[model samples]
Target: SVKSEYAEAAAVGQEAVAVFNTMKAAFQNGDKEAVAQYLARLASLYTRHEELLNRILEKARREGNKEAVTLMNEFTATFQTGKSIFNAMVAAFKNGDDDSFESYLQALEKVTAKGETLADQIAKAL
Candidate 1:
């Protein structure tokens, strides 16, 4: 049951990464429109992820177990990082400068990769 729940969360995370990849490619191609589209998709996925994570936290509070608390913490940290990266990417696109955009892209890649790994860890912990 724990693994199953974690797997579900991982699925959300996987979707997030896929969206991020799309955005990255779009950025690399210098296609603002494509980047916007992927950004929208990523935002939707993140909304759903937040809902699921909140439910998990609520469940953990009800159960009051050490594992649940620890897992919740991990999920929060990873989610925050992912959200931050997403925000930064959006900002870069909005700014519309080549140098700034590329710099943000590099930062975004680093953050998302780490975020994805941490998300997997959190999911497995669940």
Candidate 2:
């Protein structure tokens, strides 16, 4: 059961990452509609991923698996930061603020790095 849960989580994670990458490409090409579409898809995927993670986190806590719990928490934090930056970027794009959008993109990249690290830790834990 745990193995299947881990597999599902990993699949969702990959889907989210792919959507994010496509969204970045759309943003770079200045395709506002494509960017919006991809961002919305990414948000939906992340929501599902978060639900799975929360379930796993609850299981981990019940089992007293401190390491898994900590890694999951860190992953969630990084994911949230990335989401926030992405939202800001969307707002900047909508406002025609190229400068702010670029800045937010850079910040989002950093958040992505943190998320990747946490993702690796969580994967290993599982």
Candidate 3:
């Protein structure tokens, strides 16, 4: 059975969260290969998750609760930024310059900081 849309969405969201946690731990341990794999999966999951959230927001709009829509929009943007940073680092790894690893580490800080700043901005906007 398909169950309810909300239930399905909850399941998907939970999976995405679990994947993100794995990615976080992998990155912390400097396991670049694991981080790359998990991050790729997370990005794919995020696309589906965002789609489901937008559908929910649309239903909410019909019933006149528009506030959550704004929050969802903010979250989607933040998610995209994080995914971009991860993908960029993965590209850096694949494209290998003499200093690619060192460059990736430096880029990692800047990229992550950008995501943090975006999240802060979203919070401030709220």
TM-score to true structure, per model:
0.79, 0.83, 0.52
Error of 2 at 33 (Å): 1.8
Highest TM-score scorer: 2
Please say which candidate is ahead in TM-score: 1 or 2: 2
- Give lDDT tens digits, candidate 2, residues 1-114: 544786798799788778877877888888989987886787788788878878888888888888988988877777778878878987887798989988998898787766
72-124: candidate 1 lDDT, tens digit per residue: 77767766776786677677677776677677668766766766665565555
Q: What is the lDDT of candidate 3?
A: 0.59
Model 3, 26-113: lDDT tens digits are 7667787897787678668767866775676566556555564565466566656655655665676577542554555455456445
Worst lDDT 10-window in candidate 1: 117-126
Where does model 2 exceed 4 Å of error?
Answer: none
Give the C-alpha miss distance for residue 87 in model 2, angstroms. Answer: 1.9
Q: Count the backbone clashes (under 3 Å) in each candidate.
A: 0, 0, 0
TM-score of 2: 0.83
Which number leads on lDDT? 2
Candidate 3's C-alpha runs over 4 A off are 1-11, 24-33, 96-126
Question: Which has the higher lDDT value, candidate number 1 or candidate number 3?
Answer: 1
